[PDB]
């Protein structure tokens, strides 16, 4: 027998346990709101042929007027936002921002800081285990779209077990050729191209006929509660930006292709519902990081 | 059950048999005798 | 939390001993080695010194006793009296050494009572 | 609640001078720490919420009878607000001030064998915030300078680089260092109005939140109730 | 010899030893009082099509004003009550509610946390052991009414020993056919349908003739001291609600069909007198739980 | 192979589809509210040694002052309440009460006919099927506490499959002697007295050793949304009163021992979620019938 | 909506006289009548709510092209507010009033073969409420009088005990009987109880509440005719009169 | 010969034929406009620490004032939108929304029901059929990017015919190794990495040499007329939400991973010009659904 598992589901590293309280949640929400105004003010300044809208936005964000001979860095708010992002990723991060500094930055604007007002759909497909008998080869490639390639070399048809976990809401299976799939202790139906599955409905058995390889394409959707200001496009940009800037470069951590893979992998770890709340706050901070750094490159 | 001290837990701790000279001497002698 | 259970089956004897130490509370029960059904490894209790739970779950280490049941019982009775005035390491170290090495306790007063 | 309110090193040292060791020791039997448990957080999730218990939670826990247990009980009181259950310590020792235990040899306690790395691991230093860590390092420096272990404290800080950045800038035995110190050590203060009466997911965060919300009520009413029992003593 | 025992009396798991002081008892009583106000205010709010009665009661209960964006779950008072309930059920459940929060929530209302003002009657029948000879089969079924089915295949009549726990006050036995029951070393009376027994007198012996089986139906009544606010109907509803929500899902614990089985089983274990006091406080806490969840519904 | 099922789950008759709108729901709520005052008026009469509290309560309920000549019947409200109870039980029962009369009676008191404010716990144990192999006898008896007696006369141990449905939340199993139970495709644990199960988990297999019979006692808890005024003690008493008064004597209907059995049987029928809402309204109507008839026997 | 608001026999028959058949017929495709379906009721349940569609729902359904479907569309319009999809009936039949189809031989429609029991079963008389059954019985009596089938109508009432008790009392040829009749036939109206903007579980109940809430809006709308305040502005031909007689009655 | 086709193109189930008139199109546009106000008001409530903006927008959407202890679901407007969405997906889904309800809701806001003001680009790659000789193997995976793996085991080079349909505008073919592709009855060009193709040009022939397998990656772009308010990101999020909630669980229907796959599959079926009009209204309805549920969440 052989076991195949998704690459991104392996060994999720522990996440930080700091800056997750109500006061720190408001600061991340404050940074996101003020960073958005920086982007809008720069567009207004360019159109109006006046730097007055940008000066107000920078002064609110950085507590200092812009200067031609001083580099525009975002002030102490930028440093605090950078440091909390490092802490969220790993427990080994320093987490040196004082509580007095966080509290004073949350008073710049009034926001609830609630991280459960809305939801977001995550597309990463979690194949926890694919169990295949002898004389069969199974390969799993991809995260957003998982392609499972199976070859049957033996004499007769083989049964292959698929485990999609208990967290994902729905899973769609599509095959290169029609195939048979059924739950445990259930009769097999007539072969068809597309199957819609509920991952909580036990493992699924796939009949693999001898001959040409069968390829199954898997797509999944999972809903995770997120704040109303969450924007997946901006979070994804911030995640890529943070890796290139070295904010995630700590010892004994795992690296992912996208924030989609990061949040799903931490969800599937043992006691993973603890980590999912911290990952959402990290995503919001990355949304603030992307807007702030695009407006004030360094 | 009364409160537990740390006396028992220190006894069952592993020891450095190589770094300690007395422990190394003893295992060389037994290996020779065997 | 530290708890320890000793079950002694002396091959050279007719009686067995069960010693339990939860923290600094020591209890023992002497049991007969005959008349046992296949269900349980212990016969009827002949001498009681408290309540001992043999269903405790943990790592099991097998050892061979180097003293008789009378010698083991003598130290157990003495250790019960000095349970409050001795540390857990001393309570264990003296018991293990006598059972496994036939080494008499270094404490002279404890040695006399045994 | 009083100890968590101090925000300066000289306030914290002054409080420890007037506080007996009895206040740092709980008479509640509590539960054994380092236990993986499932707790109920119904404001957020329908399912039970995984968490692990620790000594630096706000709830009293069973403590060991050794000297290590007593030092851990003192630090937990400073960083979390509650001590641990160590029974029958002694009337004479319990009357002494907390600072007397940490910084004086007349108490009769020996702390030379303490390993600062082991104590930090037992207190889950990885889960402590910056203010809590600074308070813990203050207790280590006081213990180190009493025992003549100044070098060991410095070497211990070199190994733990993140702890070195937030190390308090005071030398025990020198009054000038305490006067000019500018550290912020207030875990609990008058809340910013934005704080709401809402639960938190973690055990530590919820217990810290409980102390924060009840500080305003405690501030107004503690003086009269303390005096109602203090007079005619 | 064969031994048969009641299923629910087997291995009672230890109960919690925390939150049993005078201050914690006041907190449970305050929660019950404030939950009763909450359930009454929801009725008034529904009748009058106004949120004024419910806002006043919820603010008293949760120390916070209801908000449309947020979710109404009871606030910090609900969080403490649910977590203390788990602590009572098992010693493996942790104690995570600080004493500052317990003292704060007990000051909301002025009540006396006395759990021994009144009494309540519990109907679980304890059959500690039934001893039968080799050639007899004995089966015990049921907790509220225990039906003991006995069949004798041997040549001679068999004597079967019935041991009821020393705690129960009265046990009433009714048989499908008349039978003879008497105390140990006492003369056998004529066969009759019904017997009234006090378990403290001693073990009982039942004579089984060879032939058709005899079924004995047992009912018991035990008085346990409870606070005046105790309501068995509300306590039973809260016990099933807590089980369905997963509050009692703790490692190495036993599960029971009703609160009556739980309190009687814990009474019959060693240190039962100490255990019953905690169970009574858990009963009041479950009464507060049931009224709180019914007032604030989650689909 | 033999199949055994619960007697009360067999062939639930269709419930009525009338008098389940907002207007009729407030009529049942008003009747429950005004019948409660009818009972409470008797206690007030004793305190004042006067019949004027009862006269006031009867006049509001019956739209007419009570007379010493005739027996108190309750007037138009009693006639309307009796007829709607008949219609709820069976679809064949006529819907004879006009909407205008329901309209007028619902305006007497201010109520909201919302039947989803709260929940109630129903204790009927659903055993859809018990599958047993040959040479084994299985007998299912009881509704509140289901006793399953199993005897095998074969050479070896037999496996018995238990199916508790998908509606019930918690099922507790207690055996006369310790036994082994596990889900499909799971290892079998050591013999244990008490099992806690969730019916959604799946079919359960019980090892039945050869020898003395094994009896398993089953208790179940199901949560059904009910109005805040629901009182199970009064609903159960009203169910017995209606059955004795001949309000359920219609052709091709099934009869049940308690409202507990009635509501669970319709729940487990095909498209059973439709019947639950109608049965809940019938329960509130029976609660009003119990109080009204106890104050005014006929 | 307007047909459901009529509360007396005189108003119902007066409305049917001025309403052409094309109002009964619907030109929306709808769906097949008898199907077990799952609908979404998110106010109450997370799962889909089973129900069975029927011809007396307020939404148009597909109808048979025979005469049986035409009569069944007329009754569904009267009792539910909407008809069914029967296209290409013809200009001559569609321009006639509903009363003319039900009562007059000059229309050219032959309906003497109709079976009242089968029509009632197809319309799900068991699911109808008291007002709905009274309205359908009015349609049956008008059809019986047109075809000289008065005896058959009485026997059908004798077989169905609940229908006999609520059967309206009027002779389909005499106007004096219509004026005397005091049966309340309103399905929608001003509600004495508390009416809220909340959904109902079944298709029939939810669709009925939409008309009830729509009628309240219609009552306060500018399209509604207020007899008390604007009686003089009404045209004389359609003004309310005490001596109002249907033609030929 | 062996024939291979894309999985998502196979057997498109018929779409609904109801709620496609001007009145229903106005209702969907009104719902989308009002849902956008609902999501913006909730943001404003967070920034102002006041529930007035959200209560203000919920009243317009649901025609009811929010009350505590009652779950906010969207009122009658949510009921109509959810059930109309089901009817658009499949012809087997019932039509249960009255015309009086559609007309009333369509009058809440002034807006046009125009669904052909603008256009959008869809990236599903239509591979109707791939015809291959006996000694070759062809496998097609993917919808947004289609990888066709071809292996030749015969003695000589084989010709594979590619049919991309007639609907897609441009198809870009990229190969793992340079390969030759030409139209029917056209001389083969030199080996190239990439080919830009017009699907209307006709069937395309690919020379597959003997040896290592050749993988061809296909990307396609098509233009479909959509209203100006169309947002692809919002439509796709609503499609996954509708699937999770189970609105698309109807008998004898086909399930798609994305709305891009769904609209392309219906386009390539017979009478696809009529089907694509209904799908566009469904996409706008799903955009309204996505914004409505994100404003009013359920745990």
Numbering used by the authors:
A (entry chain K), F (entry chain F): 2 to 299
B (entry chain U): 25 to 58
C (entry chain W): 287 to 400
D (entry chain Q): 1 to 233
E (entry chain H), H (entry chain J): 2 to 300
G (entry chain P): 1 to 249
From the reporting publication:
Here, we report atomic cryo-EM structures of three states of BAV virions—surrounded by 120 spikes (full virions), 60 spikes (partial virions), or no spikes (cores). The spikes protruding from the outer capsid shell are heterohexamers composed of a VP4 trimer capped by a VP9 trimer.
Visual inspection and 2D class averaging of purified BAV YN15-126-01 virions on cryo-EM micrographs revealed two types of virions: one surrounded by more spikes on the viral surface (hereafter referred to as full particles), and the other with sparser spiky density (partial particles). The ratio of full to partial particles was approximately 3:1. Icosahedral reconstructions of full and partial BAV particles (at ~5.7 Å resolution) revealed that they share overall structural features except for the different number of spikes on the virus surface. In the full BAV virions, there are 60 spikes sitting on VP10A and VP10B, respectively, while in the partial virions, there are only 60 spikes on VP10A. Two VP10 molecules are identified in each ASU, VP10A (closer to the icosahedral fivefold axis) and VP10B (closer to the threefold axis). In contrast, in the double-layered full BAV particles, 120 spikes made up of a VP4 trimer (for membrane penetration) and VP9 (for receptor binding) emanate from VP10 located at both type II and type III channels. The binding affinity of spikes at the two channels appears different, resulting in detachment of half the spikes when the partial particles form. BAV entry into the cell is a highly ordered process with stepwise detachment of viral spikes, as reflected by the variation in spike arrangement on full particles (120 spikes containing VP4 and VP9), partial particles (60 spikes containing VP4 and VP9), acidified particles (60 spikes containing VP4), and core particles (no spikes).
